Structures are given as structure tokens and as C-alpha cells.
Design a protein around this ligand. Sequence first.
Ligand SMILES: Cc1cc2nc3c(=O)[nH]c(=O)nc-3n(C[C@H](O)[C@H](O)[C@H](O)COP(=O)(O)O)c2cc1C
Length: 138
Amino acid sequence: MKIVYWSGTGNTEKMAELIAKGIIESGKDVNTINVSDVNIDELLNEDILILGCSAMGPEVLEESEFEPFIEEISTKISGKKVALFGSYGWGDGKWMRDFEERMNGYGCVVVETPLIVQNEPDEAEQDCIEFGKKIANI
Ligand SMILES: Cc1cc2nc3c(=O)[nH]c(=O)nc-3n(C[C@H](O)[C@H](O)[C@H](O)COP(=O)(O)O)c2cc1C
């Protein structure tokens, strides 16, 4: 499987590692890829797209790298299963509510409730591992 993410300080990156750990513990292989190193064509062969990005301002996906990536794959992901996650700071998840609506609007099937964690996981580490386990059971 593959996990694609963008992280500015490392909070979403840590979540990605924990989600990967959950998938691996379930017995499956998985690679974590930063959005800047992703190959669109290879990513589209995946049964499930696991995408993460922290909340940028004002309550939007990161603009220079992550959003253009979403825009690029938007026309080629209809019918695909997707799992979404990300870290946020002072808001209450608006950027994620919008991200979920958007992916659904492109025809994707959001397989699980998006996982959002405030700042660094730390206290929520097991929740990240558990999210990976749920995805591995799909
Ligand atoms: C320029 C900027 C804008 C931000 N805008 C928001 C926002 O609108 N809502 C929010 O909850 N957090 C916002 N944050 C906080 C980040 O989402 C938060 O620090 C998160 O933990 C970053 O995770 P990362 O290291 O993966 O990027 C913003 C952070 C930055 C640097």
C-alpha cells in the first residue's frame, strides 16, 4: 500500500509513520511517500489511496504542493477508496470536512472517518496505529 502526505513541521509525517506501523502490524507492506516524491501513475494503481495533509490557512490544504497534486489526480480517481488524515492546530477540522466533501465530490469512496489530531500525535499515537489497522482490513 502507499501513504502520501505533506507535513510542514513533522506532525502529519509522524501520523503517517504510525498509520504505516498499523498496516505493517496487520501483516501488510506499505510505503510512506512525501507528496513531492510521488509518482501519479504508480499511485493510481493502488486499491486505496491514503492521503494526509495538515491544516494550512485559512482552513485549506497546503497550497504549493499538496493541493496541485489533488487537482491533478481529481479526474482519475472516481470509484477509488480513500482514507484521509492530518494534523491541525487551532481550528476544529474545517479543512478536513472540506477535504472529505471534495474527495466525495470527485467520486471517491471515503472508507473511514478522517483521522485528525491536534498538533503532534504523542497522546494519540495508538489512534493512528488503529486507523492503519482499519485500513488494512478493507
Ligand atoms: C501558515 C499556517 C497556517 C495554519 N492554518 C491553520 C488553520 O487554518 N487551522 C488550524 O487548525 N491549524 C492551522 N495551522 C496549524 C497547523 O495545522 C498545525 O501546526 C499542524 O500541527 C501542522 O502539522 P504539520 O507539521 O504536519 O504541518 C496553520 C499552520 C501554519 C504554519
